[PDB]
Coordinates of C-alpha atoms and ligand atoms in Angstrom, one line a residue:
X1 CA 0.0 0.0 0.0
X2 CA 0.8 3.7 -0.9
X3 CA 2.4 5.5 2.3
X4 CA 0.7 9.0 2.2
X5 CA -2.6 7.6 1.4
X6 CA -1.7 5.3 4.3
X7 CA -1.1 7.9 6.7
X8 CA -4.0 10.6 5.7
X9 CA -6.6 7.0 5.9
X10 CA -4.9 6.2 9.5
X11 CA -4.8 10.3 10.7
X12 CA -9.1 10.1 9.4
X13 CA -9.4 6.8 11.3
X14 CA -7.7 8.7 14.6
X15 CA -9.8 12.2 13.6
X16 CA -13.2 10.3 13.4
X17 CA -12.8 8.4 17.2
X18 CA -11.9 11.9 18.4
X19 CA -14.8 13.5 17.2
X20 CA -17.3 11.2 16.7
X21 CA -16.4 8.6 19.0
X22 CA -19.8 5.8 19.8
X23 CA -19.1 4.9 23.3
X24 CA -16.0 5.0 26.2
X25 CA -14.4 2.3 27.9
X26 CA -13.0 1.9 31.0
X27 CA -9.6 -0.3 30.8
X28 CA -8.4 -2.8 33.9
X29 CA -5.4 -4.4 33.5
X30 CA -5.6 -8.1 33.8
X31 CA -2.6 -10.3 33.5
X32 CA 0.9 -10.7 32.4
X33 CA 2.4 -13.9 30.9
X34 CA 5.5 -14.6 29.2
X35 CA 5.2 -16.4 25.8
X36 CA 8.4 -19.0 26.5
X37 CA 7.7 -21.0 29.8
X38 CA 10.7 -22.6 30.8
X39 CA 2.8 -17.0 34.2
X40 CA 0.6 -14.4 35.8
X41 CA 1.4 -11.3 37.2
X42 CA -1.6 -8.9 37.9
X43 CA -1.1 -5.6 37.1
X44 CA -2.4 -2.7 39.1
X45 CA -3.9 0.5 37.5
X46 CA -6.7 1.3 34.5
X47 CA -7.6 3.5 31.9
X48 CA -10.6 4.9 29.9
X49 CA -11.1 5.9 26.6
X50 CA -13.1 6.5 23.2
X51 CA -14.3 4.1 20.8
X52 CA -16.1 3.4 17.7
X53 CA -17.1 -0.1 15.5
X54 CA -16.7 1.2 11.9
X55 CA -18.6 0.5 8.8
X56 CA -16.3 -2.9 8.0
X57 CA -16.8 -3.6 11.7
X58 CA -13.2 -2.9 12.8
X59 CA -12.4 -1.5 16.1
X60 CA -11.0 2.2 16.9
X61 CA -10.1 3.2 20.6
X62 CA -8.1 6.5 21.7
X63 CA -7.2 5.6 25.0
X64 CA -5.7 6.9 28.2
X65 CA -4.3 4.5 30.7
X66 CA -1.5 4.5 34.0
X67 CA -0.8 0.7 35.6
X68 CA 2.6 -0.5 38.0
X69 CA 5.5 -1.4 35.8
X70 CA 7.8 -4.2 37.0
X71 CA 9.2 -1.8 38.6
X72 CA 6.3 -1.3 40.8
X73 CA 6.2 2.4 39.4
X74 CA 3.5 4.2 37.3
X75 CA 3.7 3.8 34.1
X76 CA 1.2 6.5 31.7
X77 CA 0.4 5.6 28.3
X78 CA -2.2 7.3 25.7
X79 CA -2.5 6.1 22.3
X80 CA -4.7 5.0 19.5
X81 CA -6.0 0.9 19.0
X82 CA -7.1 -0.3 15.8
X83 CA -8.0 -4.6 15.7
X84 CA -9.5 -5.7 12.1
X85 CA -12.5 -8.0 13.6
X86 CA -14.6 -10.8 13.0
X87 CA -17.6 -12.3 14.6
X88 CA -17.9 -15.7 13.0
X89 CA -20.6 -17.4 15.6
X90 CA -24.4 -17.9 15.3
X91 CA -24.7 -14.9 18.1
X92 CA -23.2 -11.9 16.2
X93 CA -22.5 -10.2 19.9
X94 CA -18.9 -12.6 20.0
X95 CA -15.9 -10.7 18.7
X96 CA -12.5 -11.4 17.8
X97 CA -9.8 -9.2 16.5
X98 CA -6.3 -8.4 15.6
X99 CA -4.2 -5.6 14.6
X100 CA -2.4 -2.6 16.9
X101 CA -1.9 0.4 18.8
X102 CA 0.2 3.5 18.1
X103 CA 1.2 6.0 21.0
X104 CA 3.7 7.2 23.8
X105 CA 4.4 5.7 27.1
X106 CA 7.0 6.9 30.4
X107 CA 8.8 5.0 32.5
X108 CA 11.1 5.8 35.6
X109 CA 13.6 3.7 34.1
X110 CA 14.6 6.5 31.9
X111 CA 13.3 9.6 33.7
X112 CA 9.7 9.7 32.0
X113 CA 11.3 10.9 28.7
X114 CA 8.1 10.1 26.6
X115 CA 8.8 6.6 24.5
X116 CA 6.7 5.5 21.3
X117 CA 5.1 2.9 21.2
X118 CA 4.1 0.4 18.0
X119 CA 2.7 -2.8 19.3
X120 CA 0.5 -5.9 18.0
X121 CA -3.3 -6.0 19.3
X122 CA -5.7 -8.6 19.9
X123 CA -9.1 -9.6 21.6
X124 CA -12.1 -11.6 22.5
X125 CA -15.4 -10.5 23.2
X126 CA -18.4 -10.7 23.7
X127 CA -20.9 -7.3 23.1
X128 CA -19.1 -4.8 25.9
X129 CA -17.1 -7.0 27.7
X130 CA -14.0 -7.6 26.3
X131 CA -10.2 -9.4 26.9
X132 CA -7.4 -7.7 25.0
X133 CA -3.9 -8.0 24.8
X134 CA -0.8 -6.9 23.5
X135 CA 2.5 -8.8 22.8
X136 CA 6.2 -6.7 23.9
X137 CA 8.7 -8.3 21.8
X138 CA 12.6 -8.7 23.0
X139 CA 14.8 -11.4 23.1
X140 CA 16.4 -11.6 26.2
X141 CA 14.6 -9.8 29.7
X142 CA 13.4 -6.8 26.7
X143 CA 10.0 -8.4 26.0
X144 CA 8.7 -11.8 25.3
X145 CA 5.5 -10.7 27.7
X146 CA 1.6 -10.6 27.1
X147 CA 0.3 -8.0 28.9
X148 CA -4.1 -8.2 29.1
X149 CA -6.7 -6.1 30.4
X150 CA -10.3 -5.8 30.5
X151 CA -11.8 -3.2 28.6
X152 CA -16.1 -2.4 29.5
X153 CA -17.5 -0.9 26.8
X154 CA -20.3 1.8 28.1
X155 CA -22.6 4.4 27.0
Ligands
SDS1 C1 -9.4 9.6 26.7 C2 -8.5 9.4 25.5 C3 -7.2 10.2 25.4 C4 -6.4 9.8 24.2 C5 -5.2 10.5 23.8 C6 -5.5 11.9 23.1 C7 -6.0 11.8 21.7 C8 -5.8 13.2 21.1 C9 -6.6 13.6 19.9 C10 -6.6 12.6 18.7 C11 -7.4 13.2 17.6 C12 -6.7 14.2 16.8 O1 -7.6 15.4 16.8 S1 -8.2 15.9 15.5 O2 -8.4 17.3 15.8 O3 -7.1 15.7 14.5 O4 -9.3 15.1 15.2
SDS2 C1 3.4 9.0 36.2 C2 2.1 8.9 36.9 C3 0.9 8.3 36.1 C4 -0.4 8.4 36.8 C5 -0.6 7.4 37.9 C6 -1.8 7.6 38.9 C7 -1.3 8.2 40.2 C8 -2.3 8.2 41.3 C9 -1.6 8.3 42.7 C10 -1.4 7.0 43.4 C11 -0.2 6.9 44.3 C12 0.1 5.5 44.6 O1 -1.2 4.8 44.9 S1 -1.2 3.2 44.9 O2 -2.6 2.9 44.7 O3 -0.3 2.8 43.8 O4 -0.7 2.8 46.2
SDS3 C1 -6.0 -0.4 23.2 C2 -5.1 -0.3 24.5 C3 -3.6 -0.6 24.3 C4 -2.7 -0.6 25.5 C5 -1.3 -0.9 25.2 C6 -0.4 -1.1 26.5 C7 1.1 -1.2 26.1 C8 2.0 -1.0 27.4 C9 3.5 -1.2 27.2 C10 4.2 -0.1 26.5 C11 5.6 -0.4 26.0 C12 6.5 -0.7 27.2 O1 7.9 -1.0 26.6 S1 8.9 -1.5 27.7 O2 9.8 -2.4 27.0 O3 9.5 -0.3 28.2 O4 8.1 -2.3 28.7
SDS4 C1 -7.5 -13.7 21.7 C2 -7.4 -14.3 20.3 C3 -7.6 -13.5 19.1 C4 -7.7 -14.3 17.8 C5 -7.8 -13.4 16.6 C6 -7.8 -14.1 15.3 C7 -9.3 -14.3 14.8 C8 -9.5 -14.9 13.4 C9 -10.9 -15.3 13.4 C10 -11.5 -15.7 12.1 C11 -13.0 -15.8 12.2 C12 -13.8 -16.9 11.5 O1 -14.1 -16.4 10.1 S1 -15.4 -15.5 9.8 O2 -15.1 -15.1 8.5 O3 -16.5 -16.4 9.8 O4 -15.6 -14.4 10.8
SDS5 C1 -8.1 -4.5 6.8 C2 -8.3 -5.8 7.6 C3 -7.3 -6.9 7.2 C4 -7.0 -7.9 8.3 C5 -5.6 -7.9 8.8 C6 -5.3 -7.6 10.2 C7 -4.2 -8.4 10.8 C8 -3.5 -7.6 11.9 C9 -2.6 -6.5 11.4 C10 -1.3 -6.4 12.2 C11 -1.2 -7.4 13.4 C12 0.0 -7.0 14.2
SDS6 C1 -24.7 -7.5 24.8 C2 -25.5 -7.5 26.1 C3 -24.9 -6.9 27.3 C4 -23.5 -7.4 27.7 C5 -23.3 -8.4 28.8 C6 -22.4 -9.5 28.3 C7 -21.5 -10.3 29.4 C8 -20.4 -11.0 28.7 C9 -19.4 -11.6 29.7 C10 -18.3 -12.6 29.1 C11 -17.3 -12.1 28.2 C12 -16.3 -13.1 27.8 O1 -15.6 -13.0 26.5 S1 -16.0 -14.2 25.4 O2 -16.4 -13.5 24.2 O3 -14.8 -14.9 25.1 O4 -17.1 -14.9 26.0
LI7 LI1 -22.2 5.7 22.9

């Protein structure tokens, strides 16, 4: 695909959940687990956001969020989700999806210089109650984590 008409479709997709967003959601992190056993941490914090179910039935979220790191310190990060979905069961209210989220996070590690962030999505749901995740990749103590939260869907 054709990078400028990439970017104007993706700065549209963010523009549109700004302004007209459908509903908010409020974001609990869940769990952490690491993808190579030889897991479960549980993740303090939680976010809200914006969201919308577009036309080819494809998730947008602009989100807002703050959780412990493994540091145990706050950790902020705001972004935009995107997750290409399908719902492929008799009762159209189950949802899966896959796809990812753009934004900035902080960490104490390196004084709360603001990082960006470019990171795989995906989810299960069922009508506003949904488990989604993302993957950190890194090879060697970097990454290798799932990190899930639940995400209501309201108004
Ligand atoms: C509760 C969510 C907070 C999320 C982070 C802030 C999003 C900033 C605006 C994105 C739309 C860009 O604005 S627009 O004027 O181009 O449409
Ligand atoms: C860089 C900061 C990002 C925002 C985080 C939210 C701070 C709320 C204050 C809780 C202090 C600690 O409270 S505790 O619930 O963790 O014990
Ligand atoms: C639709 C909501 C999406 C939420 C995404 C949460 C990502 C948190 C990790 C940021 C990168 C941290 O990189 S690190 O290597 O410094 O840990
Ligand atoms: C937490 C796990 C996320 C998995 C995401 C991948 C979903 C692929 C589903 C195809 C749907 C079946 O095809 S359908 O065309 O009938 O909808
Ligand atoms: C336009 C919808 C096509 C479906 C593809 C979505 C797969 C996930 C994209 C990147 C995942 C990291
Ligand atoms: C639409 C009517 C109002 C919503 C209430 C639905 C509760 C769903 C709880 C299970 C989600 C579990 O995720 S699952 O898709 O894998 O089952
Ligand atoms: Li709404």
């Amino acid at each position: 695909m054709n990078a400028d008409e990439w970017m104007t479709t993706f700065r549209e997709n963010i523009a549109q959940t700004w302004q007209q967003p459908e509903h908010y959601d409020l974001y609990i992190p869940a769990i952490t687990w690491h993808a190579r056993f030889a897991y479960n941490e549980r993740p303090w914090g939680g976010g809200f956001g914006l969201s919308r179910w577009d036309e080819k039935g494809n998730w947008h979220g602009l989100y807002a969020m703050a959780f412990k790191d493994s540091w145990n310190k706050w950790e902020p990060i705001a972004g935009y989700g995107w997750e290409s979905t399908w719902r492929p069961l008799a009762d159209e209210n189950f949802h899966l999806g896959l796809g990812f989220t753009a934004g900035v996070t902080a960490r104490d590690n390196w004084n709360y210089i603001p990082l960006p962030v470019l990171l795989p999505l995906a989810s299960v749901g069922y009508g506003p109650v949904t488990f989604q995740m993302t993957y950190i990749p890194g090879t060697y103590n970097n990454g290798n984590v799932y990190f899930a939260w639940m995400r209501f869907q309201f108004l």
